[PDB]
Ligand binder design. Structure first.
Ligand SMILES: Cc1cccc(-c2ncn(CC(F)F)c2-c2ccc3nccn3c2)n1
Length: 303
C-alpha cells in the first residue's frame, strides 16, 4: 500500500480548527500532514468537503493539496478524517498577524491567492472536465501560506459546483452560509440571484478584495506599514451579525479605508485599484479572478 490512509497516521499537535472539525498536525510515513477530524454526527459536512476536494482536475499549486478522506475507529467511536498537506506557517490570518511583508512578499501572496481562485472558478469542458467551483467562504483564515511565501486556498466545505451542460448547481444552496464580515453586499441584502452560478463567483471576488486589503496593510516600505486588522474592524463589532454588516456595507455603502500612503508606491496603487474593482456593489462590474491574476502577473514580472 503506497496510498495515505488514516490507520498509518499519528497525531502530534492540535493546530486549530476548520469551520467544522478540529485540525491536528500528524505524521504519515515520516512526513508531516494536516488532519481534520469530524464526529459521526458531522458526516454530511465531512462528506461534502471530501466530495469538493475529489473534484476532477482540481489540483493546483494555489489550492490546498488534498490527500484522503477516511474513517478511524478507536474501539469506542469512529472519527471521520480529511487529510491534506501541512503548511507550517498556518493561515494567511496568522501570517499577517505575525509579520509585515515586503512589496515582493505582498505581490506573491496576492497573485498566488488570485491564481488559486482563478483555478477554482475556471470551467474545463469535455473529457476529464472540471466544473467551475465557487468558494462561498473566502477569507484570510481560509488561506494558508507555504514556505515559499505563496498561498493556497483551503476550507472548501461550503463550495458549490456548476454543471454547464444542464446549467445547474450541484446542491440546493442555503442563503448567507459564510463568514458575515466577508459577505458580499448582494449576500447581505439577499438580492443575490442564486439560480445564476456567476453570482457566487462574483461574491468570492468581493471577499478576495477584502483579503487583498488585509495583505496591503502589512506591506512595509521604508519601515512604514499599518497594524493587522480584519476588514471593517473600524465599523462593526467582533462576531458581527448580518444586520450590522448590511447597515455598513449596503446602506451606508462603506468599504475598508484605502490609506493615502498606498498611492506613493506603484505596487500599492495596483493593489488599491484591484480592491476598488472587487468592492463594487454590482457583482457584474467586478474584475474576474483571471483578470486579477493577469494584472498581478504583469506586476510580478516588472518587479
Ligand atoms: C481538507 C483538510 C484537511 C486537513 C486540514 C484542513 C483544514 N481545514 C481548515 N484549515 C485551516 C485553513 F486552512 F482553512 C485546514 C488546514 C490545512 C492545512 C494546514 N496546515 C497547517 C494548518 N492547517 C490547517 N482541511
Amino acid at each position: 500500500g503506497h496510498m495515505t490512509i488514516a490507520r498509518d497516521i499519528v497525531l502530534q499537535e492540535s493546530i486549530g480548527k476548520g469551520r467544522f472539525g478540529e485540525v491536528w498536525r500528524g505524521k504519515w510515513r515520516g512526513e508531516e500532514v494536516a488532519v481534520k477530524i469530524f464526529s459521526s454526527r458531522e458526516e454530511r459536512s465531512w462528506f461534502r468537503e471530501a466530495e469538493i476536494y475529489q473534484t476532477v482536475m482540481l489540483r493546483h499549486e494555489n489550492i490546498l493539496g488534498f490527500i484522503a478522506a477516511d474513517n478511524k475507529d478507536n474501539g469506542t467511536w469512529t472519527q471521520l478524517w480529511l487529510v491534506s498537506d501541512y503548511h507550517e506557517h498556518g493561515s494567511l490570518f496568522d501570517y499577517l498577524n505575525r509579520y509585515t511583508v515586503t512589496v515582493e512578499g505582498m505581490i506573491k501572496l496576492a497573485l498566488s491567492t488570485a491564481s488559486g481562485l482563478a483555478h477554482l472558478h475556471m470551467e474545463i469542458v469535455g473529457t476529464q472536465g472540471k466544473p467551475a467551483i465557487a468558494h462561498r467562504d473566502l477569507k484570510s483564515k481560509n488561506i494558508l501560506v507555504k514556505k515559499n511565501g505563496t498561498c493556497c486556498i483551503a476550507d472548501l466545505g461550503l463550495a458549490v459546483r456548476h454543471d454547464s451542460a444542464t446549467d445547474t448547481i450541484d446542491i440546493a444552496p442555503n442563503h448567507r452560509v459564510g463568514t458575515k464580515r466577508y459577505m458580499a453586499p448582494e449576500v447581505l441584502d439577499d438580492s443575490i440571484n442564486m439560480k445564476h452560478f456567476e453570482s457566487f463567483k462574483r461574491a468570492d471576488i468581493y471577499a478576495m478584495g477584502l483579503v487583498f486589503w488585509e495583505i496591503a496593510r502589512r506591506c512595509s516600505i521604508g519601515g512604514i506599514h499599518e497594524d493587522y486588522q480584519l476588514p471593517y474592524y473600524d465599523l462593526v463589532p467582533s462576531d458581527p451579525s448580518v444586520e450590522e454588516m448590511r447597515k455598513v456595507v449596503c446602506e451606508q455603502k462603506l468599504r475598508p479605508n484605502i490609506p493615502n500612503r498606498w498611492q506613493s508606491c506603484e505596487a500599492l496603487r495596483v493593489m488599491a485599484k484591484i480592491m476598488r474593482e472587487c468592492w463594487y456593489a454590482n457583482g457584474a462590474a467586478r474584475l474576474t479572478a483571471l483578470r486579477i491574476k493577469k494584472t498581478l502577473s504583469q506586476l510580478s514580472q516588472q518587479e
